[PDB]
A paper describes a structure:
Self-labeling protein tags such as HaloTag are powerful tools that can label fusion proteins with synthetic fluorophores for use in fluorescence microscopy.
HaloTag9 increased the fluorescence intensity of 16 fluorophores, including rhodamines based on the popular SiR, carbopyronine (CPY) and TMR scaffolds. HaloTag9 showed altered electrostatic surface potential, as well as changes in dihedral angles and rotational energy barriers of the bound TMR compared with HaloTag7, explaining changes in extinction coefficient and quantum yield. Hence, HaloTag9 showed the longest and HaloTag10 the shortest fluorescence lifetime. All except one fluorophore showed notably higher brightness when bound to HaloTag9 instead of HaloTag7. Photostability measurements showed that the higher the fluorescence lifetime, the more photobleaching occurred, making HaloTag9 the least and HaloTag10 and HaloTag11 the most photostable tags. The increased brightness of HaloTag9 relative to HaloTag7 makes it an attractive tool for applications such as fluorescence correlation spectroscopy (FCS) measurements and fluorescence confocal microscopy.
Author numbering: 3 to 295
């Protein structure tokens, strides 16, 4: 079955006075492949994808600040905080040119960094990514009232912080197949202490839905405008029914975006990595072999 282990040796780097953890496997030479997770996951989400890429390419998978095995300072964990820490993580590792593999909030980080530093990005593989959601009617009906409740300081914090609903409920409702207890324990581990759950609540409050928050909408629009014109090689994975993007819009987008290959992974919600890791990993590896890297 789908692997549950996390066999990767820990690596740590000091970033803005805090320690960040990252996976680092594969050959030391060549262009590195930088894997960026989202909410409420960690590098654990890439555990079954990396082994398809690591034979031929260096794979770097950081835990976002406040998440995974990274340090957990008392921040607001706004998108801007993650931008500051990820910018500094990339420089602290001395990365020059990279290929990005990105998901959920990791995709906002990756696309925003790529738009600002396009000379350093040699390809982008992406899935279930942050885009403007024009109205609440484009958010999946089965999850709509809860995400609306998440975006409050009263009910939303009670659910996400006090009761850990993003881990115990939303995560599982983001995967089609059932998650095992061992997998759930890996996802629970960074957030056993309720005071460490701020990122889990701030992230859904940053989602660009129905024009709010205006600053995130503007930033995401800017990187989507870039992506619609840039020649950067692109690989889009999508599933049915999806969460952040529905199938027809995914297929339409992959046709519209320059130099973009699309892969239908079959059934999927948000964490496509948990529903078809072998296809995602094998297709990333095949696509990498076509790039000038
Ligand atoms: Cl979120």
């Amino acid at each position: 079955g789908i692997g549950t282990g996390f066999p990767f040796d820990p690596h740590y780097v000091e970033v803005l006075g805090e320690r960040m953890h990252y996976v680092d496997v594969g050959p030391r030479d060549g262009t590195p492949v930088l894997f960026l997770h989202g909410n409420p996951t960690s590098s654990y989400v890439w555990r079954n994808i990396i082994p398809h890429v690591a034979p031929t390419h260096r794979c770097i998978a950081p835990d976002l600040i406040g998440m995974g095995k990274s340090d957990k300072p008392d921040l607001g964990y706004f998108f801007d905080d993650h931008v500051r820490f990820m910018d500094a993580f990339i420089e602290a590792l001395g990365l020059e040119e990279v290929v990005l593999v990105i998901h959920d909030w990791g995709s906002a980080l990756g696309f925003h960094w790529a738009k600002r530093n396009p000379e350093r990005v040699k390809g982008i593989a992406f899935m279930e990514f942050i885009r403007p959601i024009p109205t609440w009617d484009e958010w999946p009906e089965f999850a709509r009232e809860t995400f609306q409740a998440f975006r409050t300081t009263d009910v939303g914090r009670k659910l996400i912080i006090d009761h850990n609903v993003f881990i115990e409920g939303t995560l599982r409702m983001g995967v089609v197949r059932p998650l095992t207890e061992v997998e759930m324990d890996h996802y629970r581990e960074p957030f056993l202490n309720p005071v460490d759950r701020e990122p889990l609540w701030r992230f859904p409050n940053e989602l660009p839905i129905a024009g709010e928050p205006a600053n995130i909408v503007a930033l995401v629009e800017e990187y989507m405008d870039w992506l619609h014109q840039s020649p950067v090689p692109k690989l889009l994975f999508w599933g049915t029914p999806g969460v952040l993007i529905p199938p027809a819009e995914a297929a339409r987008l992959a046709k519209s975006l320059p130099n973009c290959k699309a892969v239908d992974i079959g059934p999927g919600l948000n964490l496509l990595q948990e529903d078809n890791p072998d296809l995602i990993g094998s297709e990333i590896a095949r696509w990498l072999s076509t790039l000038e890297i």
